[PDB]
Amino acid sequence: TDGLWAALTEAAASVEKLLATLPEHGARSSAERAEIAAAHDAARALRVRFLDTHADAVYDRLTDHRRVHLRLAELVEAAATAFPGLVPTQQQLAVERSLPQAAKEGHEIDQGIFLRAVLRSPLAGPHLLDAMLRPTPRALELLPEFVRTGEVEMEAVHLERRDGVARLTMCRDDRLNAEDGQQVDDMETAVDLALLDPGVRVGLLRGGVMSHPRYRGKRVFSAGINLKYLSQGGISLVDFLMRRELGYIHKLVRGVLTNDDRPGWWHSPRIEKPWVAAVDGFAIGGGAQLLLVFDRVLASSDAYFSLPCAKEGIIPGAANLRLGRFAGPRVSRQVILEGRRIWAKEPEARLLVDEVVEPDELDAAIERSLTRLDGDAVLANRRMLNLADESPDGFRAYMAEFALMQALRLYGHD
Amino acid sequence: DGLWAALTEAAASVEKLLATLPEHGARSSAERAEIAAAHDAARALRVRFLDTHADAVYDRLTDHRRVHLRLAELVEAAATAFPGLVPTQQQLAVERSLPQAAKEGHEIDQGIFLRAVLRSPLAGPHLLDAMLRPTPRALELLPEFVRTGEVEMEAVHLERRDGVARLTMCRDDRLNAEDGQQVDDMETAVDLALLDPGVRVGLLRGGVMSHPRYRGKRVFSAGINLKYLSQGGISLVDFLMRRELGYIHKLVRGVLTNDDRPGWWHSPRIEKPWVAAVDGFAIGGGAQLLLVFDRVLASSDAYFSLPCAKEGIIPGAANLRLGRFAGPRVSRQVILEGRRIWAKEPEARLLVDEVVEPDELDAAIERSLTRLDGDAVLANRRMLNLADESPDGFRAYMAEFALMQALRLYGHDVID
Amino acid sequence: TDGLWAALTEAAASVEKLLATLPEHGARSSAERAEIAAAHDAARALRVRFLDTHADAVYDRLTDHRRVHLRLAELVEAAATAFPGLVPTQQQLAVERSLPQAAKEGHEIDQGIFLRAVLRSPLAGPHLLDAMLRPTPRALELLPEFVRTGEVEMEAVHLERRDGVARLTMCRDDRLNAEDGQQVDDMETAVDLALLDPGVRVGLLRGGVMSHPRYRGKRVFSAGINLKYLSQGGISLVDFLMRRELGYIHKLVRGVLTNDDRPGWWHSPRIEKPWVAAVDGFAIGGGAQLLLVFDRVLASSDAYFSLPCAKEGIIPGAANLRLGRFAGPRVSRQVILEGRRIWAKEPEARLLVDEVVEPDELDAAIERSLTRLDGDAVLANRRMLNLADESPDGFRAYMAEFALMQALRLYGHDVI
């Protein structure tokens, strides 16, 4: 129309040509490495410039002018087929996934560029965020048996309904509840079921008993992202890092968006419920990120909280968005930039934790706290609080930049 | 189109059913579900009509945003100009004579309306400006206040001294519990304090109580009148919204005047610093007020709480403002779980600047009134309030609040 | 075209007639002083009204529809020539600068009105802010020699590259690093060089050894604005108060905006780096304001922090924007409105300072902290943090109002 799509198509062609004619990654010469790096850079710069003016038109083709809610996975897949060279195809990602991270060309970065541009749009952004708040198909599929049975066993999460509480137990006993793509799917499924189940009034997140010998018999909340999978190239930008932030973690804040199915939808299109978190052992990385979103947080006297995501190379999700509000900008930089670790019994733990109780009194204090969040008044108040604490624009703008900043960190030399 | 026609139909089915059905509380199970269903269909259409037509509606009522109408006048004019969108004065009269439990909930329609108005980037700021303008009552009382320095109201006693507007909340029988009259007296007093050129600083304090448990003792505020709430005397528009957009917002941003003085081009609103002194306790609406003052003092024996949650409603704009003072953990402890903060515990310093023994309190109040005098304080507190609470932030909150609070006003746990 | 430019031209003409025919400032009568004050007020009111509707058109003429980046000094100069009477000429400002503050007509206020209107625009505002993030010509000029030698000596700042650290030493040993127009130019130049030098990974700001007899041999961070120059009329609204906020202080937050010169510009158009501050003695006023944008802050056990500006009659830069986020609204008003002074060893110092060290361990603790901020991961995380903490709209809206509020404080009576 005015040159950008054609110039991008060309820049992507030069990339495919070099990737076809050059040696494999570990065999390229210094001159060859600079040649491909420059080609990638020229294509990505044009991906940004194309979308600065054409993002809404692209999103409209993919969503039929914002009448079809597409989740992240479906969105980036449809974008690849409808706009070749804008974002990688399923195949090109398949090739990337079989390689070690160091040998990857970095095609996920193109998805970072795309999702940044979509979320920056005041029209496309809120619509994509709504799509991710809708219930997952898996959860709709499991909902009737959960209502009948009160119990669902998944690979990384055990869900149980007892006394109007949805009890989510993170139960990866071999690896201290380290996070991967499967844990995100199980968590979102369980969060969806907790919110849609009419016999659930409050949610509870806790780590289960561990089996690994260093922690046998001990509960552990979360050791954060699976560093092995990160190194091997098993951590997906879209299906893990973005999915968790826009899916289950955002649903803890704002609920699940339903269809116009029920009375009161005109005032409450989303079903939200209060959430309690109980921390045993420690909350590290992604686990600690979760605590910034709960209505009540309890911890054992011996627990600690840290975000070592820094020195590790990557951004701790939306902790950079939320932590300042809890601890102020000095402490939030101490934790995020310099890896400060906060112990449950030091005074500043009160910035993250409501109750710190000795292991022998912890179970009973958890139970008491589940009784204190029951009514419709709690729902209205937590909704107004979350609206004040984190505006839709605030969250949307952060996740937009995050999509690309985190994509780049995923492929940095660190 | 038809958007307005379908609403007109849905409201007609409501009026039909209300005319032919039994009085509330002797309707059968089938009858109660039918009217509930009719209300729901009408309210759903009120929302969608206004999602696309709010600006056009507001423009008809305000002559394209060239007439400032306050809340009461706005919803009245909306009812006559758009029958079935919001209740008439009469229908509200009928609602008010009933107990909360027997009400049909017509105030919810006003919640729907004010939500849509405040959501508009054009209508919203204009309505908020209208509510920052001086009340007619205050313009009426201003000359005598300037001459006399003294105005005795129902729940408030204004008094000018050494350049201080001394507001004393003086409902000695009921611990300064809030009602529609107290809001009118407070806004009137705040308007006079800001318009009186001999006033440099404002002071809010509770007066000596007469009720026997507190005779001789000052008490700041026991919050909303729970008796009146149960009886249906708490108005969504004239109490809950009026206080947030009127006097409480004026404490933050001042009164908007006409272009009738020098410097209006840079300061269209007259704002002044405010000091609050808490005796006994600040509960509910009283505690909400502390989040808006430039200095807060409290007696050693005072406490602060927002039981508005336990009651069944939202504590005004505390959900907007408290997180900024105490962070999201403490603010949920106070609002969701009813935590009560004592003047002498460390975290009181998140809400209170000075905690003084009763015998040194009067003198510490006086000293604090001398420290906020200049034009430099005005400029700095204006920049601080602009940073702390953006116009969009407040507008977006009050928009959702208008409807969320309307629904809580008619929820079943409140009808206790 | 709508009457506003002509009415402004008239109002400015009546000002000029009166200034030509009236006595000099200290010889005017009561009636004469009221008349010129009224003429100024009418002209300034029209400057505001003209720009409320015409600001974008004005900015577009000056910047060729936002395709030429002009810094503040160049912008207001071009505006004076292209729109006579909107803002003062270089000629008129020269006359103002030759007078004491009390005798000035206040023409800088017109620049406050102009910059407020520009920054309020969602189109012009971000574009002006980008222009001020671009490298200064002086820094581009000094960059090659800095890369070669690793060392630059300026009047108020000594810059040294060492172990990948840009070491900025504020070195006004005679006056405790009091700020003036030259210090702003040196600071922005040094910050530009630190960001553009590829051998610089982290920045460090510290005060040098003092020579004044009360502090001989002792380091001092900053005593804030030069109060002597303020009284004499040597503090420029544009070249000092606005320049520092939109130039080097904003560059500490967001980096320098470069040309499309380098790989990765499509994702990082600005070069940002982490900054460490080390406070010896005290940080007062503008010095304390700087601590609010650093990534790590260290302080001597004996240091204190204060913003006595308010007591002086002026606003402490963007402290009113940033401080609440560090200390909450109670403490931020205690510091800004009531002049509270925070000592490095009291508990609430931890709201501003990461480490408080005894003088004998301070040098080594500074060195340790410089090694801890090296990677690309730190860069991405501090970028996301700063985006969350302070939005572009938030900063832009604040600086817009600040431009005029601070201009008025510059000419208020308690400042003179």
Ligand SMILES: CC(C)(COP(=O)(O)OP(=O)(O)OC[C@H]1O[C@@H](n2cnc3c(N)ncnc32)[C@H](O)[C@@H]1OP(=O)(O)O)[C@@H](O)C(=O)NCCC(=O)NCCS/C(O)=C/c1cc(O)cc(O)c1
């Ligand atoms: C220090 C300690 C807490 C305890 O140390 P013992 O000596 O008590 O424990 P053993 O080490 O014996 O524990 C038994 C087994 O569990 C494994 N394992 C542990 N954590 C992880 C992990 N994050 N990813 C993968 N595996 C993990 C451990 O490697 C070992 O493997 P073996 O059985 O093959 O030997 C430990 O967990 C520790 O050092 N943890 C490191 C945690 C860490 O740095 N996490 C990264 C934070 S960063 C993070 O989460 C980024 C993030 C960003 C986002 O945008 C979203 C998100 O969701 C996450």
Ligand SMILES: CC(C)(COP(=O)(O)OP(=O)(O)OC[C@H]1O[C@@H](n2cnc3c(N)ncnc32)[C@H](O)[C@@H]1OP(=O)(O)O)[C@@H](O)C(=O)NCCC(=O)NCCS/C(O)=C/c1cc(O)cc(O)c1
């Ligand atoms: C705990 C204590 C404060 C003290 O307990 P003693 O034992 O010291 O005190 P006695 O109970 O003897 O009190 C002496 C006299 O004062 C009367 N009275 C007090 N408050 C109210 C009221 N709100 N409405 C009406 N009357 C009231 C009390 O009835 C009695 O009069 P008699 O003798 O004529 O019966 C107690 O009063 C107490 O629990 N009060 C309820 C406090 C409370 O939770 N209020 C509502 C919070 S909720 C709130 O404010 C929501 C709110 C939301 C908004 O969006 C805006 C807004 O503006 C408000």
Ligand SMILES: CC(C)(COP(=O)(O)OP(=O)(O)OC[C@H]1O[C@@H](n2cnc3c(N)ncnc32)[C@H](O)[C@@H]1OP(=O)(O)O)[C@@H](O)C(=O)NCCC(=O)NCCS/C(O)=C/c1cc(O)cc(O)c1
């Ligand atoms: C408190 C103390 C530090 C006490 O220290 P001793 O009493 O032991 O030390 P001596 O005071 O003798 O120190 C030796 C010499 O240093 C000179 N000097 C010092 N400060 C300044 C200054 N701000 N401006 C100019 N000169 C200054 C002073 O003249 C003196 O005499 P010599 O002329 O013979 O050299 C004192 O200096 C003191 O009270 N300082 C005032 C601090 C103050 O109010 N600052 C302004 C706050 S307000 C402020 O910064 C507003 C502001 C707003 C903005 O938007 C941007 C911005 O950048 C600033």
